[model samples]
Target: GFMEDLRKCKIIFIIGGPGSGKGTQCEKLVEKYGFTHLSTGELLREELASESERSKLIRDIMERGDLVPSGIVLELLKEAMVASLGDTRGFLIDGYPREVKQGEEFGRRIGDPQLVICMDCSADTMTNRLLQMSRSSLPVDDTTKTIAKRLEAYYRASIPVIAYYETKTQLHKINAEGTPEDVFLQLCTAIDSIFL
Candidate 1:
């Protein structure tokens, strides 16, 4: 019954190229507007805490800097959604629809999102940000390699996903080249405009 009043709530998908500050903007949006932040990375990390074989496999794949299979990722997303059914404030799904097929599957499974936010940033800015960040224990491939792979993946797969949402008139592009606060302001403006 907690979500009974959430009939009007909207699901927003936050998307961007790797290191485009999508996660950071999602955090800010959640903090300020009480939206549920459902990040695929966070969900996968939590799955790793379980002792199941699937979790272990995901952990291994993530440690190797490879993407989890789309089926597994979609399953995790469904689980996250069901678990958060009582959250009435709506949700911001981050880092999803990584592939064109995944996006198609997501549309079939979850229906169209109320909004799709793309954090736009230059590759140079992303490279600089990654270089300044601390390294993690996971096998996060070399920056250059990762960027190259991501760009290829983006062009081959993710671009179609964005195009899909764009065709639906649900895509909102936000400049992500500024400071966290600045980017957040832009995001907030976009969200507010939707309501206005």
Candidate 2:
């Protein structure tokens, strides 16, 4: 089964808030480590493009302003993983497990992430960056008000996720307030330790 095949591949989860440089760090990791990036946001967007029944359900849920089921997300991740098995040295899962239950289910169903990286930063730092970037070419809907909303959700949901991984000793907390190069160096060190 593909799960058996997946056991040979390193599973890494990166958890971070918006403006935490998570995407930037992931890109660097991909370049240096050849890890395949699995973004749930992208996964859901792709699912929405499909004509399957589940996709229709997802659209219905979106229309109703309800949360999509995590089971469906887990299914998508499993399919994505199997599809990328040939080229993947490892997987870097970004933004799927927004809660502890999601993480637990993923661990049980797929496999426990060998490493979980949390990009830690102050609330103020995150808010400032999002506010500053709001003036750029991003969608007009992404204003400071929405930035606050997203940050609140992140901070609220992140505590349990952080606690869950910390208990397992599988979590690496990185200070994301520094320069990108500085943060990347810390991430590299954490990942390098995993192979040694």
Candidate 3:
């Protein structure tokens, strides 16, 4: 099933420090590409709140700023992909494969992405943006300390995966400090170039 389906679809990955509008840009990219956007963070929230067997365990793991076991994460991904791949040409996977093995595992279990887009922005900008975003009161993890720790892991964990894709010439770096319009245009250019 994985082979019969996944091999026919294309994929794109988004990587960025928190508050960098990685997900924000995805909203428009979806319109341009007409592809499903699979965010592991989103799936974690959905699955962790659902009646699944590992939902509670997943909540515990996420609270500690660590990744869930790949088996669980990827299984959820596989199910979602199989169910939705028929409706679209490919998918724009958001905030996943944060580590090198994840891309490799997905390639082995399913398939590799067509591109890995990293939104480059400084810590100060992202922190300020996150603060303004969370002023309305969100999760407990919205605090600066917790956010810093999470970014630390987010950046460190993703470095290898970024490098991993670089060797395959699938990595695209964008300056996300600009307006959302700028980033989206850049993203379009990058994805379009792959077709060129």
Candidate 4:
């Protein structure tokens, strides 16, 4: 019954740097609220498994710790949104708007989100988390290098996108400095005020 009402809503955008606990918070939100969790990285990884030529290029780009081109990323997001339109609850798009261009394109493709949740975390916190996590098999994109690169990239490319959403009054800043449960409680309170 809750999902029936949620189905009529637009999506939420969850933006954060790597190891900023975006994924963990998203998992909790999905568990409690039945929202679809759509991570751009996961979508790109899925693309890597496809037989299409673009998939190979996407894999290569990701292997090199490079951000996938906005066009490709947006396409994947649009496809996911279309696929989930028939479902009840909306989505929580994770790790998106890596660049301002991606943010602009998202506005064009899906319109603005009903909410944009920014997991605000320090660079030190992000670095520590990445260092503690297991490394992936990708050669060009090791954990240390990728963490540094993504953090720098976020400052250069992503922060402005968050500011853009703020100007539009769709952004909610959440301090991602606590335990998982603490962060989840903050997020739930925010969402409840908006939707309940």
Candidate 5:
């Protein structure tokens, strides 16, 4: 049933570096388009914080900036998507699929997206943002030592993810260095252009 409904659903991936404004823009997209906005990181946190074997397992892995075996993440994603069956036109899925295979696996399940939106920002800008937010515990892996590892992992994995999707459909690149509203405006324009 999950696969059956997932097949007809339209899924858009909002890809970016850890602090590349993906979360901020995703919120705006939810407001503008009335789509169900699902951040993979946020979902992981929610699940892991709940009382479950999978939840505990995922938290342990993510704390060290390691992935929580792909199926666990995908299973979480599927639940979210399938639950929102009628409430949304589709989904704005944020921050998963670190590389080609991950994207391909999801692509196989629900088909490719109408567009894969990428927010481009320098590693320095993102690093600074992470430093500012390093005060918080939500990301848990944002330590000075760990940020380097995170950024390294982001670049190493995301390149192939985008390249793999390049031929599948469209990618709308956003210069995320702008103010939050400015970035949202560009996103609105680009996303609107697609359905216009």
Candidate 6:
């Protein structure tokens, strides 16, 4: 029988603002560390792929340019995490715990994370990167105004989450304003420093 407990899973939660290269870092980490990458965005999109009332509501929320409710997001994450249990070395969770309440709820429902990493990058850098990157399909709400709104919304809730993790001595900061190689090296270096 497989171990179904989340507390036995090595969970490393990634916290970063939009365009902070979290997705790229997770990809590299997956290759380097054999972690199961579960991103909030990808999870939502996958859920939205099916035809259901919940999926319809999620798509409507996304199309209306708003953040999806944390309840649904957390539910999806728990299901995915449970599915990957005992199959991977660890879980690289991105785009979650966006607020203090969310973090508390996650800890209460799921297990406390073994590590919490936050990618530190400036708004200017994130904005420029978001603008320069080429997407297969440009979103209707991909304007500068929308980007700024999203960034502000993130910081408004995210600062407290970072502070909470810092007080718990579980927060690790990485400068993500550099090349992918440099940023990834920093991630690896930090991960090796203590969690070896």
Relative to the true structure, how large is the alpha-carbon lDDT of every model? 0.75, 0.87, 0.83, 0.77, 0.80, 0.83
Top TM-score model: 2
Tell me the tens digit of each residue's lDDT in model 5 across 1-196. Answer: 6677788677788788888888777877898798998877778878977879767777678779995777777788888888888888778888657767777787786556777888999988998888977765546454666888888988887888888777787888899989998999988887877664
Clash counts for all predictions? 0, 0, 0, 1, 0, 0
Off by over 4 Å in 5: 1-4, 53-66, 131-147
lDDT head-to-head 1 vs 5, winner = 5
CA RMSD (A), model 5: 4.1
Looking at model 1, which ten-residue stretch has the lowest summed lDDT?
1-10
lDDT, residue 144, candidate 6: 68
lDDT of 2 by residue, 1-196 (tens): 7877876678998989999999988998998999899998889899999878878988888899898888989999999999999887899998658898888898888887888899998888998888777765656456656787889998887888888888875789999999999999999999989866
The digit string of per-residue lDDT tens for model 1 on 1-196 reads 3233233456788887767787777777888878888877788878988778878888788789996888888788777776777653667888667666777787666655778888888877776676567374545566566666666665565677788878775688889888888888888988887755
Ranking by TM-score: 2, 3, 6, 5, 4, 1
Choose 2 or 5, whichever is better by lDDT.
Answer: 2
Screening candidate 6 with a backbone cut-off below 3 angstroms (N, C-alpha, C), the clashing residue pairs are: none
* Candidate 3, residue 2: how far the Cα is off, in Å: 4.9
Structure candidate 4, residue pairs in collision? 7-88
Question: Residue 173 in candidate 6 has what lDDT?
Answer: 91
What are the runs in model 1 whose C-alpha is more than 4 Å off?
1-9, 53-67, 134-157
Q: Which regions of candidate 4 fall more than 4 Å away from where they truly are?
A: 1-8, 53-67, 134-150
Q: Residue 143, candidate 2: how far off, in angstroms? A: 5.5
**Cα deviation of 166 in candidate 1 (Å)?**
0.6
Q: Please, what are the lDDT tens digits per residue for candidate 3 over residues 45-148?
A: 78977867768788778789886798888988987888887788678898888777777888888887778899998888888787777763556555888778
Q: Tell me each candidate's TM-score.
A: 0.78, 0.91, 0.84, 0.79, 0.81, 0.82
Off by over 4 Å in 6: 1-4, 52-67, 134-146
TM-score of 1: 0.78
